[PDB]
Amino acid sequence: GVFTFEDEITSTVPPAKLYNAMKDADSITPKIIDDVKSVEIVEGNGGPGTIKKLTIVEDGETKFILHKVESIDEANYAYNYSVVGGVALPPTAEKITFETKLVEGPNGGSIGKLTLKYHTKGDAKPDEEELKKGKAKGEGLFRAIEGYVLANPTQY
């Protein structure tokens, strides 16, 4: 089945700037997020169909995560990717999709809109715990991009 959740998050940074930073997330996230060590393009050119290997450290243990890039709408500050591999993905789960979109906040800031689509095998429902982890992963992504931008203002 497919189980669908939505979260939102605010920033002071405007969306255009924040979105350009999302594009460089493969180079940003390993710097600012401690667990993340690197992000390698394994197959593809960075566009839809691309597979990325993330290398995590979770309790002094090296783990891998595989992302599939699903779509990229730069007009709508949108970036959609799927977790398709690794330990972070549950054995009950076919895949987990992160659909991101930045939109304008009411003070010239921005609003991160996450739609999380958790694809299960058969009649399994998602684990309430792995939902907390998934939502948390998405926050840390956003905070990393935001942090990078605020710490490097001339960059964007």
Ligand X SMILES: O=C(O)/C=C/c1ccc(O)c(O)c1
Judged by CB under 6 A, does residue 109 bind ligand X?
no
> CB of 77: closest distance to ligand X in angstroms?
7
Alpha carbons within 13 angstroms on the beta-carbon side of residue 123 total 0
Applying the rule CB under 6 A, the residues between 48 and 107 that interact with ligand X are 54, 79, 81, 100, 102
Q: Which residues pair with 96 in a beta bridge?
A: 83, 118
Applying the rule CB under 6 A, the residues between 22 and 51 that interact with ligand X are 22, 25-26, 29, 33, 35-36, 39
User: Quick one: tokens of 91?
Assistant: 């054995």
**Torsions phi, psi of 147, nearest 5?**
-55, -50
Among the residue ranges 43-51, 118-126, 135-143, 147-155, the one whose residues contact ligand X (CB under 6 A)? 135-143
Tell me whether residue 119 or residue 137 sits nearer to ligand X (CB atom).
137
> CB of 143: closest distance to ligand X in angstroms?
9
Q: Which residues pair with 56 in a beta bridge?
A: 36, 63
Q: In angstroms, what CA-CA distances link 111 with 53, 124, 138?
A: 28, 32, 13
Which residues, 6 or more positions from 14, have their beta carbon under 8 angstroms from its beta carbon?
A: 104, 108, 109, 110
Q: Which residue in the shown chain puts its C-beta closest to ligand X?
A: 112
List contacts with ligand X (CB under 6 A): 7-9, 22, 25-26, 29, 33, 35-36, 39, 54, 79, 81, 100, 102, 112, 114, 137-142, 145
